[PDB]
Every structure is written in structure tokens, then in C-alpha cells.
Design a protein around this nucleic acid. Structure first.
Ligand SMILES: [Ca+2]
Ligand SMILES: [Ca+2]
Ligand SMILES: [Ca+2]
Ligand SMILES: [Ca+2]
Ligand SMILES: [Ca+2]
Ligand SMILES: [Ca+2]
Lengths: 332, 338
DNA sequence: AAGTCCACCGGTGGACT
DNA sequence: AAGTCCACCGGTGGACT
């Protein structure tokens, strides 16, 4: 009608409406795997030029989205547009994938020394002092979406845990396990002469991406409860509500690995580039609840540290020093 | 030059640039252009309506639609006044939709508590709308307070000082070892009404709408109760999450665990009831996650281990939300002597 | 008072069917 | 393949200063 009317409008057939609709809604996809291959095809931060190794880690992790934005602008001009939720999702995966690659190369360089091939000198990092041994080799495992960390355990340990859950599921309870982003594990005895674990990679090409992202498959059902040496959760920035998955999961890991399988203190740390204030530091001082609730065990922190890598080299240095220390707990 | 050059462009004086910014845009930390004024939206949309205590049409409507109505009205106003210029980020809608889900639902529970309290002090059972009359023996010591808790809150501050000292002395022990056990907060706490307030009419009045004074009454209520609740008088804790993601399940799971360690473990309280409300579970993932046993209960090793989170609840309508809460009170408040 | 903190969640790329 | 599931985080309104 001349004066607008909701009733009249609601009564029109679809094809009689004044506006005809002729249209996920995403327009330009951030191809994150392509982005890694492009920006980090030939660079693993902390193992490249002193410039990249020493650079503000936030700038490094941010480079691929920046390069992708520049690419998009070139090809699509003033039509180019991506949602902040895209950038957010990709930036996070990139933070995780890249740091896990730094750690992979530290692991390779450390394995190469454990096995008696000496200590690679480029770039220069202080030579670990621990006495070398094939049995002190480690694997860095970037764990996939949907993983259950329990699947790393030798089958006998899964049974122990499974039985324990049975008792619970019978009464409507359970104790699901999810997953940290990453786990470093002592390399299984059977793999200790395999060459692959000692080779540093040149960059995140697609083949190398697959290598790092699928390495967990090779160790599934092979790790002793005590041989899970470090768990890491990466969160590129924090918010107060986003802190708890790693805190909770570390608690569950300590309960099962320390409590039910008698393993040493489980080391679980969080990495972020933007703690956005200081409360997360207080939050992650929380004592491990299992250790508290029962009396037999010395109580320690669920999360050992909230770490803010300044540079890629500092991340590399910190892992090395951790290995140099944590691996002493393993007979050579 | 004919072929675009980044350096030539850099060298351009600002008055020589090809694009001339003429916005006169005030430079700020944030790039927001229109704010969703959430307290204003609550007032406009629910000024005269508390869902579950309004019209048959509202009480029985899909609760997703009720909760989504303030943002929808807001978008209407916005496109009316600002036409093509009106844009807000999905992140603004997420923030405001979240707070609205929690504030609205907490207001439904406030009205329930009032109607409940009215019955408990012997003033009978209201009928508009119609809810099943409670079978539990009325008593003024079975009144409850619904507390929408503030951002930054620490739930331990509700507890009577005698109980807070136990906790602090426990934490002091932990600190000598370089440990802590911080506590955060659930969105909402239902607590037994302290004696001193059991004759206060303000706990028996139902509110007509979320006008700004009512918003403030509800959101400020916790202050009145700070330091006056016994450990075992914390009857229900609720976290509201309008939708779920697998990574966003854990604050309430963790906090419920901490509440149970301290309240049940250290203060002898009975099972701590703690539940999540969502309108969008996105699968069965979270229902499995929340079957998790209370970690405290386990590790120590006594019988009758229970879940940390009692239930993941998905409110079909506001009416159902009220019914459930009434049903809960009816069963839970029998643990309290008349 | 501009700035900082707090806690809100929805749109995303890739794995999987 | 057409769809669902997973787990990523940054922009936000209001409190507090
Ligand atoms: Ca991963
Ligand atoms: Ca899974
Ligand atoms: Ca992560
Ligand atoms: Ca609140
Ligand atoms: Ca606080
Ligand atoms: Ca909430």
C-alpha cells in the first residue's frame, strides 16, 4: 500500500516482494598452509639469519597474515576484505605451527648431539652440558585437532586408564581427556637409530608441514607414562575466560599420569605473545588439584610457567635449557 | 609514474596524494563506529517484559528468539537512523548477545526466587503465569537469593568471615611452597537467604521489567550478601554460555572443581551444584565433556564421587527455565531445616 | 577523563566423512 | 562432495579510574 504495512508485506508471495534476493558467506579465504609455505618456505625462525632469529617474535608470527593481506590487495584491490575472525583463527594456528617447528629443529639438533654427531654451530647456541646418550633423544609432537593424548600411551597404560574410567562410566561419570597443542616425548627405544629425528628442516614447505603435523601418528601407542616430558599450550593472546582449557587439562594429565600411572611431575607450560595484563600470571599459579586432594604426594603447580617468547632465538634457547635439565632424569 | 611505484608514493607530500582522506575521523584506540548500548537495549526490549512472567506468547516462544530480540531491535533502529552507514562487528553482537543471555536468564530466576520466597514466608503461591505449586513445607529459612555476580568477582567473598579465614590459612600454607589456589566466579549464585534478611520484602517482589533501576537492583544485589553466606548455603551456581565451542567449555568446569575442593573438601559442605546453560551446544561434544567427575572427589578416594557439572541445560523456552528452577528449589531446599 | 581491565562469543581453514 | 566438527582468538560495553 502507499503507507508501508508489515501485514501487507508478510502476505506477498515470494515473487511479489519489492526486494528480490539474488545472492558460508566468506569471500576470500586465508589459505594458511599456503601462507606458511610462502612466508616460511625457507626460514625457520631461530635457525635462520640473525635478523629473523633476533626479531620481535610478534612480528615474525604476524608476517604471514601481513604477506597474505598484501597479496590479496594486489589481486583484488578495493574488493579485498577478510573478517577479523579469519585473521584470528589463522594467526593462532600460525603461532602454534611455527613455534612447534622451532621446537622440532631444537629437537633435531639435540638428538644429533645425543647420538654423538657433535653440536651444530649455525646459528650459535650454547652446547648442552648433559652427557650425551641415544636414550635421551626426544620427539616434538604437534598434536592434531580432535586428538586424545592418552592415545600416545603404550597399550598397557591405556588399559590402566580405561579400567579406571569403566568404574566411573558405570555411575554416569567419566573423565574424558582432550589434548595439549604439543607434547615432547622421550623417543621410544625402537626408534633411537632412525635418521629422521635428527634432521632439521629448512622451512615450512607443504611436505615439511605434513611431516611435523603427522609425526604423532608414528608414536601413538608407544610412549611410557613417564616419557611425556613436556606439554605446551599455545595461545597467541589471552583473555581471562580463555585460560582454562590448559589449566584443566594439565590437572587431568597429572591425575592420570602422576596419580594412576606413578609418573614424575608432569611439566605443562603455556606460551603467549600477549598476556593482556597480568592476571593470567596469578591464575596459572594454581596448585595441581590431584596432588592437593590426596596426601601422599608433594604438591606442585598444574602449569609450570606462563612464557612470553620475546624472540624465536629465546624460545629456542629456553627449550634447549629445559632439555638439558629434564633429560637428566633419564638414564643414558 | 605510469607503473605504480611504492617509493614515488611514499615521497608524495600529503597534498599531492591521489587519495585524499576527508573523513576527519577522530583517531582512537578502537575503530568502533556505532556502539550497541546494551543496558539501553535491555530497557527498550524488556522494559515491560520478563520472559516466563509475561504473555503466553513470550513465555512459550523459542528462547533463542527471545534472547535474540534486543540485538534485532537494535539493528532495526540502527538501519533506520544510519541507513547505509550502519555497521557493527560480529564481535560486538557476540559480546552483547552473551551479556543479554545471562542478564535476562538471571532475571527470570530472580522472579522465580521472589515467587518462591513469597510462598516460603506464608504469602501463598502466585498464579500469573501458572506454575506448579511447590510441595515443600513453607518456611522463611528456605528463602533464597539469586545473585547475578559482577565481572571481576571472587565468589569466596560471599562467605562468612569465619569461612574465609579457613581458606586464607589454607592458601597461606600453599604460598610457603610457591603455590596458590585462586578462585574466580560463576555467572550466578543462588544462596540461602541469611537470617537477618528473611523478613525483608525486597526478596519477595517480582520485577516488571529490565528498566535501568531494575537492572541495577539485580546486578547490585550481591553486595548486600557479601560475607554473610555459610559454605553449605551456596545452593546453585550457574554459568551461562549462549553458544559453545570445544575450547570455551573449561572455565566453569575448572571453577566448579575449585568450588568443590574448597567448599566440600575444606568446609565440609554437601555436594556443590553447578550447571551450564546454553542455547547452542553444537553437537554432543559438550554433553560428554561435562560428565567429568569432580577431580577432588576422585584423587582423595571416598565413595559417592559426583560430576563437577551436574547438567548442561538447553532452555527451550523461558517457561521451561522457570519450571526447572522451581523443580530444583523444591528438591534442593529440603536439605534446609524449616 | 582517556585508559585499562574484564569476560562476552561467532566466523573462520582444514580434517573428515 | 556438501556438510559437520574442531579449536583458533580479537573487538567488544560497561566498570572503574
Ligand atoms: Ca596442532
Ligand atoms: Ca576426538
Ligand atoms: Ca592452542
Ligand atoms: Ca554478571
Ligand atoms: Ca578480581
Ligand atoms: Ca558466562
Amino acid at each position: 500500500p502507499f503507507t508501508y504495512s508489515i501485514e501487507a508485506t508478510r502476505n506477498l508471495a515470494t515473487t511479489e516482494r519489492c526486494i528480490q534476493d539474488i545472492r558460508r558467506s566468506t569471500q576470500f579465504q586465508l589459505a594458511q598452509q599456503n601462507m606458511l609455505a610462502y612466508t616460511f618456505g625457507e626460514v625457520i625462525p631461530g635457525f635462520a639469519s640473525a635478523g629473523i632469529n633476533g626479531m620481535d617474535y610478534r612480528d615474525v608470527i604476524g608476517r604471514p597474515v601481513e604477506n597474505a593481506v598484501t597479496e590479496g590487495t594486489h589481486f583484488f584491490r578495493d574488493d579485498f576484505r577478510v573478517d577479523s575472525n579469519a585473521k584470528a583463527k589463522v594467526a593462532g594456528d600460525i603461532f602454534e605451527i611455527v613455534s612447534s617447528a622451532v621446537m622440532w629443529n631444537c629437537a633435531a639438533r639435540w638428538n644429533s648431539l645425543m647420538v654423538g654427531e657433535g653440536w651444530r654451530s649455525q646459528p650459535r647456541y650454547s652446547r648442552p652440558t648433559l652427557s650425551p646418550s641415544p636414550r635421551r633423544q626426544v620427539a616434538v609432537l604437534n598434536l592434531p585437532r580432535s586428538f586424545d593424548w592418552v592415545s600416545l600411551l603404550v597399550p598397557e597404560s591405556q588399559e590402566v586408564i580405561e579400567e579406571f574410567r569403566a568404574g566411573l562410566r558405570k555411575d554416569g561419570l567419566g573423565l574424558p581427556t582432550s589434548t595439549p597443542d604439543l607434547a615432547v616425548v622421550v623417543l621410544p627405544e625402537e626408534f633411537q637409530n632412525d635418521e629422521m629425528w635428527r634432521e632439521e628442516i629448512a622451512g615450512l614447505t607443504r611436505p615439511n608441514q605434513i611431516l611435523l603435523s603427522g609425526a604423532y601418528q608414528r608414536l601413538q601407542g608407544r610412549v611410557q607414562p613417564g616419557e611425556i616430558s613436556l606439554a605446551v599450550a599455545f595461545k597467541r593472546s589471552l583473555r581471562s575466560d580463555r585460560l582454562y582449557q590448559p589449566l584443566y587439562e594439565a590437572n587431568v594429565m597429572q591425575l592420570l599420569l602422576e596419580g594412576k600411572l606413578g609418573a614424575p611431575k608432569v611439566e605443562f607450560e603455556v606460551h603467549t605473545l600477549a598476556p593482556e595484563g597480568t592476571n593470567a600470571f596469578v591464575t596459572y599459579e594454581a596448585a595441581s588439584l590431584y596432588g592437593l586432594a590426596e596426601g601422599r604426594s608433594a604438591v606442585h603447580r598444574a602449569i609450570r610457567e606462563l612464557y612470553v617468547p620475546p624472540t624465536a632465538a629465546d624460545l629456542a634457547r629456553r627449550f634447549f635449557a629445559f632439555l638439558n635439565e629434564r633429560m637428566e632424569l633419564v638414564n643414558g
